Amino acid sequence: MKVAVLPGDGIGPEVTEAALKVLRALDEAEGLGLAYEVFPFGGAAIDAFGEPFPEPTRKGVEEAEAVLLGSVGGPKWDGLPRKIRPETGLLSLRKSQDLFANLRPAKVFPGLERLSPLKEEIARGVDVLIVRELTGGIYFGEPRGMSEAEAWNTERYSKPEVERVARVAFEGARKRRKHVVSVDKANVLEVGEFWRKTVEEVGRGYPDVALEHQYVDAMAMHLVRSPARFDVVVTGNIFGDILSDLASVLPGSLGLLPSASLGRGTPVFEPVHGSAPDIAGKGIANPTAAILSAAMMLEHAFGLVELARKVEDAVAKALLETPPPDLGGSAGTEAFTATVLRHLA
Amino acid sequence: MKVAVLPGDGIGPEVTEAALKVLRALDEAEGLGLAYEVFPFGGAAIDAFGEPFPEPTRKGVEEAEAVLLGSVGGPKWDGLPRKIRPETGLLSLRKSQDLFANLRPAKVFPGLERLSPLKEEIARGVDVLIVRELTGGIYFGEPRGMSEAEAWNTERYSKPEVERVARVAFEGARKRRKHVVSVDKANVLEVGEFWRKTVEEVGRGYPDVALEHQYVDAMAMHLVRSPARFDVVVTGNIFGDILSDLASVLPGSLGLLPSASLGRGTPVFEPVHGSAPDIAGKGIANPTAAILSAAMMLEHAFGLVELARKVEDAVAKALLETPPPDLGGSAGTEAFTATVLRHLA
Numbered sequence A, B: 001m002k003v004a005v006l007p008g009d010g011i012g013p014e015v016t017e018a019a020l021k022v023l024r025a026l027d028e029a030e031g032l033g034l035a036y037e038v039f040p041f042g043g044a045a046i047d048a049f050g051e052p053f054p055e056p057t058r059k060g061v062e063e064a065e066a067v068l069l070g071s072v073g074g075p076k077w078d079g080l081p082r083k084i085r086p087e088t089g090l091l092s093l094r095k096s097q098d099l100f101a102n103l104r105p106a107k108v109f110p111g112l113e114r115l116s117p118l119k120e121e122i123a124r125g126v127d128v129l130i131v132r133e134l135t136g137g138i139y140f141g142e143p144r145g146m147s148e149a150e151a152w153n154t155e156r157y158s159k160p161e162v163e164r165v166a167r168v169a170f171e172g173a174r175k176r177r178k179h180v181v182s183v184d185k186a187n188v189l190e191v192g193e194f195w196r197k198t199v200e201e202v203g204r205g206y207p208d209v210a211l212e213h214q215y216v217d218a219m220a221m222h223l224v225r226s227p228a229r230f231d232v233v234v235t236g237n238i239f240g241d242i243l244s245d246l247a248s249v250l251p252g253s254l255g256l257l258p259s260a261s262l263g264r265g266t267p268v269f270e271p272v273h274g275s276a277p278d279i280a281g282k283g284i285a286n287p288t289a290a291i292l293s294a295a296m297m298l299e300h301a302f303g304l305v306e307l308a309r310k311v312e313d314a315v316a317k318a319l320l321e322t323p324p325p326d327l328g329g330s331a332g333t334e335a336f337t338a339t340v341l342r343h344l345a
Helices: A012-030 A045-049 A055-063 A086-096 A159-174 A190-205 A214-225 A237-249 A288-301 A304-323 A331-343 B010-032 B041-050 B056-062 B086-096 B161-175 B188-204 B215-224 B238-249 B288-301 B305-321 B333-342
Strands: A001-009 A033-037 A067-073 A099-107 A128-131 A148-157 A180-183 A210-215 A232-235 A260-261 A268-271 B002-008 B034-038 B066-071 B100-109 B126-131 B150-158 B179-184 B210-215 B233-235 B258-263 B269-273
Touching: A001 A012, A001 A045, A001 A055, A001 A260, A012 A067, A012 A288, A012 A304, A045 A159, A086 A214, A086 B188, A099 A159, A099 A237, A099 A288, A128 A159, A128 A237, A148 A190, A148 A232, A148 B188, A159 A180, A159 A190, A159 A232, A180 A214, A180 A237, A190 A210, A190 B150, A210 B188, A214 A232, A214 A237, A214 A331, A214 B238, A232 A331, A237 B215, A260 A288, A268 A288, A288 A304, A288 A331, A304 A331, B002 B010, B002 B056, B002 B210, B010 B066, B010 B269, B010 B288, B010 B305, B010 B333, B041 B086, B056 B086, B056 B126, B066 B288, B086 B210, B100 B161, B100 B238, B100 B288, B126 B179, B150 B188, B150 B210, B161 B179, B161 B188, B161 B233, B179 B188, B179 B215, B215 B238, B233 B238, B258 B288, B269 B288, B288 B305, B288 B333, B305 B333
Parallel strands: A001 A033, A001 A067, A067 A268, A128 A232, A180 A210, A180 A232, B002 B034, B002 B066, B066 B269, B126 B233, B179 B210, B179 B233
Antiparallel strands: A099 A128, A099 A260, A148 B150, A260 A268, B100 B126, B100 B258, B258 B269
16 A cells, blocks of 8 residues: 655644554555655745645655645745645645545543543544545636625535535445435525435435435534534535534534545545644654554545544543643653554454 | 513424513513514414414514524424425525524533533534625525536625624623634635735724734644634624534534624524424423523623623533433423522522
């Protein structure tokens, strides 16, 4: 399995190396035939090549089977031309691979219900995967405009756009608890009804997965009242943008969440947290998100679901045994990693 | 003060009479010059006149200074032509009075943090008022359509639409903690930027109120993480629809929430709960929402803020002293009401 590693800035190199230690560990244990190469990306790239996404890196992601991203950005590059900002290189990466779906999981690990803003009774068992459509919708819809007296934006969706995001959700659900919930506003909007119709049609080719439909406003209530009753949730751009964020607060710590973007090209797996440059090089950076991105990679890029679950149970234990500083512990990056490996056998 | 009372169906007459007992009580205590008359509305109206919103009632709301609504609807009328359904009469009512703003408060009464799905630490102190634009937006935007291959809906807003809803929020904030937060998606949508610009302009005439802007997706996280730090929240139709529902789960019981619709005409105050016909006539119906709608009426329709707060503190105590059956108590409608009156002196 070929993996393109883009460490990035700040704590990127530390947390990414933590994930590689787990991957290499598994490779020796199962002979995965893991082959990887690190490439410049982000600020490091701007400083070394002048562009956040240099061509050798573009070639690297093109030839790779998966991308393990670290963290990009930093105050140092914020005051630069947009076309060359680290954030831009990130957008370019997604375009080059035609990644149309964004996977954002939110789970409350056993024993960590205390961190959730929700009552332990309700926070317990949460394990939801929000699949958000990234390319279409109101964010890119036309016509759009603004004048001194009015403003307009269009929520538009074509059948192919809905069909493809819907497919990654079903395919993604088979790997989990085989239950998908499609969110829309069908009872008021034409786009909603169209979205509902299409997903219901698409589902016919997935008899082993159960499909359910819900209105965005109702789903917002459910995520706070009974988030644990959901598995895979698929929805539009703006709807998925709101819902992903809502669900992300559930665990009570942004530092533990990974994410992935799927499409026609090479998949991208990355931790949701920033680069935290002021902590770079001290150790202490919580590698959880990075290791979980490694797990996401195994599951979605290579189908090694059982191995992904193994790494997941490993970090879960690690969090309780040697809590990272952010969870009130004192275990540095290496310390935490060691514990994870300790449970990877 | 002239009040038009529309009891409605199910528990409507019981809970509305509970609110009237409080109002009449206050009238004797402060000589408010309260004058009211009940009119048919809802199913009762269909059964007696053939239409859910008969003309004598239309004249009644036109001549009244406020409307105290009970509860409409019931399985009995669900299988009827849309034009004559109780739900329709409700829509007609809002149109006749050009009510463009919907006020939906969500508060966790002291001692009742236990019912919230949020941790007591975070549920404590919550008292938010969501002001939602009702007439414009994507729900009514054009062009809109659908074909075998595509679907589109338009989020459109004209300056006057934004200006008016914004004004009820500032005016509504002065009566509370003088802090308004305008929600939008300005960083991505033209409509967002336009909405932000207009509200910022409108705020200039309200120097005594503090204005803050927030992105809908960020606001979704805040309502779960730190809802207590907000006072008045104003936003668009679809955004307010989602946010009102999110905030409504915060208290942990739909039966305690009132609501109001403001505009050019006679204001409408009504409890959010259904008609619960299977309980009609047994007593036991929790009058909290109705009494709180009476309080909302005093505050928004007549400006008697201090009296509204008095009724609010009354029910708050009542909930702890003689909890309604829904809160695990056994106090029936009359019992609960008596306790409220007991604290209204």
